[PDB]
Symmetry: D2
Subunit: 310 residues, 4 copies
């Protein structure tokens, strides 16, 4: 693992797992996404991980037109690296999923490193009523859902998006995902540095037990040595302890309303900025420091803000 002299704080603004019923502070409209992205960047986020939602009901959408209603606006108001999801909403085809990144030609895109069960159905039991008709069926339908990323699908994404100079945020939900990445690294379909994002607490993925983070770092060191950066995200209540653990291990951090709707125990976060501010305070207490957007670009070896199609 390459030691992160300056820590990259990534903010995942809204995602596609949480639904409108779950929090009145979930960013939905393009205008809310811009406002939240800017606030997160101003709090210290060097990178913004972005999904789009239907502006009226919050349903996940990979419509590039919705992305074009916030990407240019974010670019004009902040210098944060704009990271586009290729995961999108649960149930979308690969064509739908790659559309935004293909249209935008971003500096960074997420790249899910394996197929797994992705079960968020238990969340539905916490709510007796739902604001929109799509929410309960969406959550319930995940009991029989696989977030698909076959070796052929990964290779296609790497080839098509790699061609425009995109660098990837490799999302690794389990130990096997590290080995899946090693397969591609050995075939030279991606070049170092590898930005490895370990994901904890999803039902279908690796659990949010600390031993799992240290284990994944040990395996990543064995497979990739000094050619990778560690980043960490964890679901809900696990977010702060896991990203603090990452900082301590010489890694990078991902926070945001996509991953947890809470600022702290029993308290809904009113903004992405609250979580960015919190992890930054923790980092500072540990005598560590954060990366600026341009320091992050140099770490990830991105193509530059001026080379995108927005």
């Amino acid at each position: 693992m390459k030691q992160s002299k300056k820590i990259i704080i990534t903010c995942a603004v809204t995602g596609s797992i949480h639904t409108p019923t779950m929090s009145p502070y979930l960013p939905i409209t393009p205008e809310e996404i811009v406002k939240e992205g800017v606030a997160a960047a101003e709090a210290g986020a060097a990178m913004l991980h972005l999904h789009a939602r239907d502006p009226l009901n919050g349903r996940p959408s990979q419509d590039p037109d919705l992305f074009m209603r916030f990407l240019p606006q974010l670019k004009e108001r902040t210098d944060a690296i704009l990271n586009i999801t290729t995961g999108g909403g649960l149930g979308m085809s690969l064509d739908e999923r790659l559309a935004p990144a293909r249209a935008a030609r971003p500096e960074v895109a997420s790249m899910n490193m394996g197929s797994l069960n992705f079960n968020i159905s238990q969340a539905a039991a916490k709510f007796d009523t739902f604001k929109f008709d799509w929410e309960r069926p969406y959550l319930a339908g995940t009991r029989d859902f696989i977030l698909s990323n076959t070796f052929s699908q990964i290779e296609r994404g790497m080839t098509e998006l790699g061609a425009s100079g995109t660098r990837f945020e490799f999302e690794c939900y389990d130990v096997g995902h590290l080995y899946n990445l090693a397969h591609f690294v050995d075939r030279k379909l991606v070049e170092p540095p590898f930005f490895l994002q370990c994901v904890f607490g999803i039902l279908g993925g690796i659990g949010a037990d600390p031993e799992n983070l240290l284990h994944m770092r040990t395996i990543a060191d064995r497979l990739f040595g000094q050619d990778y950066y560690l980043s960490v995200l964890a679901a809900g209540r696990h977010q702060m302890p896991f990203v603090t653990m990452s900082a301590i291990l010489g890694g990078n951090v991902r926070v945001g309303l996509e991953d947890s709707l809470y600022s702290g125990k029993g308290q809904l976060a009113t903004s992405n900025a609250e979580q960015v501010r919190k992890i930054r305070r923790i980092i500072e207490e540990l005598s560590l420091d954060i990366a600026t957007p341009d320091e992050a670009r140099a770490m990830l070896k991105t193509k530059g803000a001026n080379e995108t199609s927005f």
Copy 2:
């Protein structure tokens, strides 16, 4: 983990990953499966893990009629526990996959604990020619293949097969599979003892690095304490070191031509019995001992040989 006073040697006779071109000793016909199963049992295998193949070309098949051409014969010639696959051939639907276990009502059935990429396409590069037309497309098609076991699919299998008194061999290909099992254990859809089979070396699953075995045991201890038995299988050259490691850790062992076509380095195994004999010799050198079929039945708490439908 419950310490295995007597070690269960499971023999996986033929499987569905290896193809006829790869070895002339791959058991194909029902008569070959009976002969091999009996030899494996006589060498010390307490349990036989079974798949069927098209008798003419070796193509994987979950036709219950093919199973009925070897199950009664095995039952009459050995007292080994007959474990029926619910994985079957790669590309089969869940209906096809559950058919043999539903017809046979076996003491044990395999139960795959999560969805994963299952890529055996690299095997094709080792052979310039193939005996049968189905082999190359089968292997190549795995680049875009997911061995599907959604939470809904797992629950269906547990409910339908649990109803006939079947005990499961829980196949865990990655750390997330342990957490997937814990979900069901917490909901009481399966009762202890849990026979956990950790699977190493599949491209799409956890790699065959020793640290992965000890890590999975640590996590299983945290999730299940004294309610589980550890078993281990590893692909190809990793088979013997991994099953020896399992024995040393107080676990059980799985060998067989399903998992490795080799008796030792650079030597094709002429029979399943060769591998069973080898692991038994290693066990004996370590001052350990193997379980008889009935000792295995008492460990797994099976319904008994007389309660099956064959």
Copy 3:
């Protein structure tokens, strides 16, 4: 490991490793020790780990008369649990080392769980001049020094101090110390709960690599299950990351000028209270909470503040 609903912050006020030349803020006199202990307790320290020093030159001393110049004063000004060292100054005999605890009959005493090389000689290279004649020879002499705690010595300490109702802070500097404790636990010379203090970063002990903390917790879980509390201290720059890691793992924390002379990177701590305040802020950011002295007494099952001989 028993989960620490409320975290015990222990403050090690001065120790015997750091010398006066190293910081003008090192507490030396009994009056400085009282002032510092009170400030640390008021900042949130539930327990104070105490050593004495020669009031004129700061040389470590296990003279019970020096302890009696701060113990009654601390008892009157705070309700913090007073933990007396049985380690004392490097080079002292066991008779000298046990004298303060034997005289004071404290609620808690430290108990070093094994013999190890204890080399602090490298610290001398950071200073071209020393305030007092004893400092350089003290540090240099540690190259050929063993902090002695033989099985006979440990048994004597446990027997003599156990007789007065003392509970022990078991100081474990390496993995073997856990096994040394297990030997005594199996012989029932100490009763649960076991307050295990893992010590990282001493040359001669286990290094300050995160993997070592998680490993020691895994081994402690195997040896002691639910009968122990985890506490952690780390030398110098490692203090804050290690105690934060402990908090995240469900453990307790030890800070203080005994272990690190710094408040943060490149900044000498002016008081023990600075470090207590810092770890408390980190704890609060993680949505965790600290234990009051009486909550700590209930956790450790101490004899009570009124049952000491001061």
Copy 4:
């Protein structure tokens, strides 16, 4: 860790922990040591780890004259590398301990990497009577014993024995010993390759739990990368499982009556050769292979058999 293409089998012939009462097959006289060393070498031992004993009563002795009654004889009858203990008998001074290696100028000498409690007193409870007067007091006296290896002592041994071209077998009884070695490696007092011998199961050292071996390998990889060879020994019943684990991990193996008096469960070993033969059979079952003495010399980079003073 450097992968051991050929495995070095070291045979520790007699040691100083086991006493004559414990087995009639314990090698005592110089003639017995020669006979046993030759048998062990002929069974496959590339290296012989040697201690001397009083020929009449078996009491440990570091008298160089006793070593000269077996070293020339071993050199003439086998080409095995002769490894001389600098540990010797428990209770000896460093002067006594270094005498044999200083006189012999061997290719290899053992080098204990830290001070620890070394308690073998529990062995006495297994015997109601003892053959010789020295045995019970020797064992009982270990309750209050430290195997001393201070940083000054280690440096002296490295300097004095390094001067004659000796390579060291670094005996590491706990994780802290790895860090102790790193201190010397960083100061260039020893040059690569480092032959690291991890020692499990001594009361006062790290316990014989498998996790401890994998952990020590992880730490050694972090501290020394590709500059070291792993070797393993374990006490009594732990010997075979631990050395088999080492083989599986790409390490080397140490067996012998010094470490275990047993050939297998409930069976006293009649000769060192029995254990060498057993580990060699296990190695061969795993499709691994052993090193010849000269292959071992090339691995360890020894000065050659002709450059010793015997």
